[PDB]
Structure 1
Amino acid sequence: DGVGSSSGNWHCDSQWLGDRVITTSTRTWALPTYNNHLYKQISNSTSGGSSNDNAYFGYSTPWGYFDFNRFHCHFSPRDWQRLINNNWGFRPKRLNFKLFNIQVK
């Protein structure tokens, strides 16, 4: 809150409590204005044509979406070594998504 006050601190550690592995991660994001704030529709008719198999019809929303469903977003290769070397399985348990420190330019 306020211009001269950071809205959240950079957490990137990877705790190993034992039977729980909290893997925080943080990266800096830059988001342009896609499609000039419009909802242009997309089809192979606009993309120059395609085969019968590749035909599609969809909309090009101007929103950007944060995607983090890849294992190396969270696990530093050393953590991945500590998790494959001695462990018989794992599964995500919770999530926590802090989006902080916006600056619009």
Structure 2
Amino acid sequence: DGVGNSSGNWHCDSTWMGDRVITTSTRTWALPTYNNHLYKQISSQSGASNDNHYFGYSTPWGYFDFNRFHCHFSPRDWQRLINNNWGFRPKRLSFKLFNIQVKE
């Protein structure tokens, strides 16, 4: 452990064991500071249409969404799964954040 020792290794791979396929994907992210570190409520501007009114809060926090497929599957890995298989469901996932560096 330390500033000099690296926390994690880049893993991007897809292995097809037999019944199960394990898809791994790694990316590099950058997180700004939102709202200058303070909550704010937000609401529909003046008025527009009865349907478009909204009320809610905007937090400084930010989040990861991998919810799309093509994150995990390369177009070729998609082609294998799609052509050779009737059905697929997920089983278990694992998430990892590493090599964080803060810049001022």
- The answer to whether the superposition gives a TM-score over 0.5 is yes
Helix, strand or coil: the match of 1:50? coil
Q: CA RMSD in A?
A: 1.2
Q: Which runs of 5+ in 2 are unaligned?
A: none
Shift of 1:54: 1.0
Deviation, 1:49, is 3.5
Paired residue secondary structure (1:15): strand
Pairing of 1:1-105 with structure 2 (within 5 A): 1-42=1-42, 45=43, 47-105=45-103
Larger strand percent: 2
Contact kept? 2:13, 2:24, Cα under 8 Å? yes
Please list every run of 5 or more consecutive structure 1 residues that lacks an aligned counterpart in the other structure: none
Range with greater deviation from structure 2 (46-55 or 20-29): 46-55
Contact 2:23/2:73 (CA < 8 Å) preserved in 1?
Answer: yes
- Report Cα offsets for 1:58-102 as digits up to 9, x if no partner: 100111100000000000000000011010010110010011110
Does the aligned pair in 1 maintain the 2:44–2:53 contact within 8 Å? no
* Contact preservation (8 Å) 2:44, 2:52: no
TM-score, normalised on structure 2?
0.94
Distance 1:3 1:48, change over 3 A: farther
> By how many angstroms is 1:47 displaced?
3.7
Relative to structure 1, is the Cα distance of residues 18 and 35 closer, same or farther in structure 2, using a 3 angstrom cutoff?
A: same
Report percent identity of matched pairs.
91
When the two structures are aligned, how many residues end up with a matched partner?
Answer: 103
**Residue aligned with 1:35, SS:** coil
Which aligned segments of 4 or more residues in structure 1 are displaced greater than 4 angstroms?
Answer: none
Q: CA deviation at 1:50?
A: 2.8
Name the stretch that deviates more: 45-54 or 92-101. 45-54
